């Protein structure tokens, strides 16, 4: 009785709305004899998945048959799969400022294993920062001081992929982290426990307080080895490259007057500059202050062999293998992001589908620029949009894997049914 998502696929667009069309006329005149639960069954793990994919909601056949009719009617380009269904996603989580109002609302009432997530999390963040990260991902304000916001994105970050992994069957090819991205990173790929990845998080953005004020960053559409050599040429010194997201985007860091100044001439250029929201200049000298005090902090944490490809933006080598003790913590706040490296790396290795679990975009357009600069055809999916409605809670999400060639484990959406004599499209 409830809406179904019933996979169709085929070599072009117009291939794909003939297959639509003999669907339709197929399941009209067997709508009597056919259960939907059997047929979506049956085009989900009967079929084998053509590249060119698309997927009808419907709650029952003659639904299905309007939906159906739609596609076959329709101009629509209906893109490509980008992966070939042998490697898993690769899990992108990216830093702060992806927060807003209520952001953990939906997904809480429509995704069981995200609300189980947030419960174990819960006791955790309240011990460590004293509050509620339920109460702060459901209030009608956004998560606002750095030592809330970190832990309330984290969590969504976390429960956003149990939520794929247990209820949809996706399990990740890589991870790959952006600053505090990388604490969700290490739990996804077990190079961490869920309770002392939070105790990095809850702790590192603590002790962040203490240093907020202590400098500004500036965003700047020029490769990192050209924004080097403007500071060495201006003499600069008080002002470092803190992040390398893409081939083409560097991120500033160090002190509030010359980073204006920076920006200021940067813009007078025409070149895409503008100032970060940030009280402190992470990723720079700013945060050598608090760098001892968080090893200490950290002196506990039992890091663990990830089981998962991690690319890190931390280590100099992003296809090695991090030891996630508290001095890959300090490290991680203290050297610069080296995230187009990560992502170059995971690319070079194969990956083609990047997903951000996140509560909005912030890197989507940087693995794109990534992949553009390899020659490459790459899916960057967003997880979460800011005021996006979520009423079947990632089940777009699991569409949008699917269409774009992401392997995963379609008995998890259909565990059980009869396979259907439905037609099988000519090669």
């Known amino acids: 009785s409830s809406p ?47 590249p060119v994919r698309t997927a009808v909601v419907a709650a029952n056949l003659p639904e299905l048959v309007e939906g159906l009719r739609e596609v076959a009617d329709g101009d629509a380009l209906y893109d490509a799969a980008v992966g070939h269904g042998d490697r898993g996603p690769v899990w992108v989580f990216s ?28 006791p955790v963040i309240a011990a460590e920062s004293g509050f509620s990260v339920t109460e702060a991902i459901t209030a009608q304000q956004t998560v606002t001081g750095i030592d809330k916001v970190q832990p309330a994105v984290f969590a969504v970050q976390v429960a956003l992929a149990a939520t794929m992994e247990q209820t949809y069957g996706v399990r990740p090819g890589a991870v790959v982290g ?13 190079a961490l426990s869920l309770e002392d990845a939070a105790r990095v998080i809850c702790r590192r953005s603590k002790l962040m307080t203490r240093i907020a004020g202590a400098g500004a960053m500036g965003s ?21 490259v803190s992040v390398v997201a893409s081939p083409q985007s560097t991120v500033i860091g160090g002190t509030s007057d010359t980073v204006r100044d920076l920006i200021a001439r940067w813009e007078q250029r025409d070149v895409m500059a503008r100032e970060v929201a940030v009280d402190v200049a992470f990723h720079s000298p700013q945060v050598d202050p608090i760098l001892d005090d968080l090893a200490a902090a950290l002196a506990d944490i039992a890091p ?22 508290g001095a890959y913590w ?27 679990l996140s509560p909005h975009p912030l890197l989507t357009h940087a693995v ?13 999916l ?14 777009g999400l699991l569409t949008e894997l699917h269409r774009a060639g992401a392997a995963l484990d379609y008995s998890a959406l259909y565990p059980a049914g009869r396979l259907v004599d439905a037609p099988l499209p000519a090669w």
């Open 4 to 50: 179904r998502l019933f996979m169709l696929s085929s070599t072009s667009s117009d291939a794909l709305r003939q297959t639509a069309r003999q669907l339709a006329t197929w399941v009209e005149e067997h709508q009597d004899c056919v259960a939907a639960s059997d047929l979506a069954y049956t085009l989900a793990r009967g079929r084998a998945h053509r």
């Open 95 to 122: 830093g702060q400022g992806s927060q807003w109002a209520a952001m953990g609302t939906q997904l809480l009432a429509s995704e069981p294993v995200f609300a189980a997530t947030i419960a174990k999390l819960e």
């Open 178 to 190: 952006h600053s505090m991205g990388e604490s969700a990173a290490a739990v996804v790929a077990g």
């Open 220 to 240: 700047v559409e020029l490769p990192a080895k050209q924004v080097n050599s403007e500071l060495m040429a201006r003499g600069i010194d008080d002002v470092v």
């Open 304 to 325: 663990m062999t990830p089981k998962v490809p991690y690319y890190s933006a931390t280590l100099f080598d992003p296809r090695e293998q991090p030891v996630c003790d």
């Open 330 to 356: 300090v490290d991680n706040l203290r050297n610069t992001v080296q995230f187009a490296a990560a992502v170059q790396a995971a690319m070079e290795d194969g990956y083609r589908v990047f997903a951000e």
């Open 368 to 380: 794109e620029q990534t992949g553009r600069s390899l020659d490459m055809s790459v899916a960057a």
């Open 382 to 395: 967003a997880g979460m949009r800011r005021e996006q409605p979520l009423p079947h809670g990632l089940r």
